Design a protein around this ligand. Sequence first.
Ligand SMILES: Nc1ncnc2c1nc(Br)n2[C@@H]1O[C@H](CO)[C@@H](O)[C@H]1O
Ligand SMILES: [Mg+2]
Length: 390
Amino acid sequence: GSMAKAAAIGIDLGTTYSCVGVFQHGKVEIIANDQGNRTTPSYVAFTDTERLIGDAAKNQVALNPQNTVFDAKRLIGRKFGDPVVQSDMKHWPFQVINDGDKPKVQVSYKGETKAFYPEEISSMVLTKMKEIAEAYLGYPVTNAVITVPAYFNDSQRQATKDAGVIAGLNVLRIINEPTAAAIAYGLDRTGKGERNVLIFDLGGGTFDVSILTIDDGIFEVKATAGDTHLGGEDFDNRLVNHFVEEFKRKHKKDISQNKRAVRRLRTACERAKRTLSSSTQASLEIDSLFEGIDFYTSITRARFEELCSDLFRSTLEPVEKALRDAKLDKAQIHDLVLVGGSTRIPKVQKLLQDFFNGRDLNKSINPDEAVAYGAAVQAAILIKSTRAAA
Ligand SMILES: Nc1ncnc2c1nc(Br)n2[C@@H]1O[C@H](CO)[C@@H](O)[C@H]1O
Ligand SMILES: [Mg+2]
């Protein structure tokens, strides 16, 4: 009669990390990759012999910075001359070239110089997310919902669809990341009446605040605000500068000019930063950090909080601006939703909860997974083809 249909997938195609989910048996499964990771770096690396995607690409970045591409989402659907592109290029070790006022990333790959459009790099990330899903499902996957930032324009949305098509995916729909996070919590399933929802999205490098109004399952974007210069990497930087000073005080040595030492310090700082979200202190233990000196120390959550205090407080400025733009008072927000791994920071949660006079924050769905979770919910809805009974 009619053969069983393959599940459709939800993909959060993130700037730094991507995430894939599938809605089956009335629930979402966020799918881990074959290294056991529930999120996959949005990285692609090129060598003389291989093209590596995800963890394999990010794990070899230190010695291959010129041919390991990341942040392609910052280039997608943009002109080479766009001022955002021109500023971002100064921070990237890989080459970005001008092809008819369209940016391309240029690398060494399999004995040749090759240039790729941002959508081609994103199609490589999408191919890995599709394979992660297929390894779990045990069959080929065709259909996907892909999410984008609410502020993406027509060109950025079309280039994201193009990336899905290059990857061999049928793109069911391009949906906004804040809308997907709201769908993850079933905030569009609460019946009749308007609900105002604030999505607080703190990423690795950027911070986005969105205000949505939901009425009978219909979403309207009321306001977007944020800070392009605020993210998890800035907190890592504060810890790096702190420990560089500490090594100077303790050993009378400046490590800041040995890239390996700085990198090993940053890697340990990011892990200590994660530990501090669950513990009140965290040890830092690096063997032979510089000149054969072992660096065995610790940091309290209170000291880390003081180090990033101004950065954490600055998340409330775009919240206030978004509320002015939406013409809403904080008491008029029905739901608060957390998105991004950096929202696990207890002090970030406390500042926002205090701002909203003690209100509960929806954080029960892993904040680095909520967007893919909502996209997976929508993908299953979009492939339904029920024929009405008489
Ligand atoms: N538990 C956690 N506590 C604090 N921060 C975290 C945590 N988990 C993740 Br993931 N992050 C940060 O989220 C960003 C995602 O690109 C990076 O800056 C990660 O360091
Ligand atoms: Mg995101």
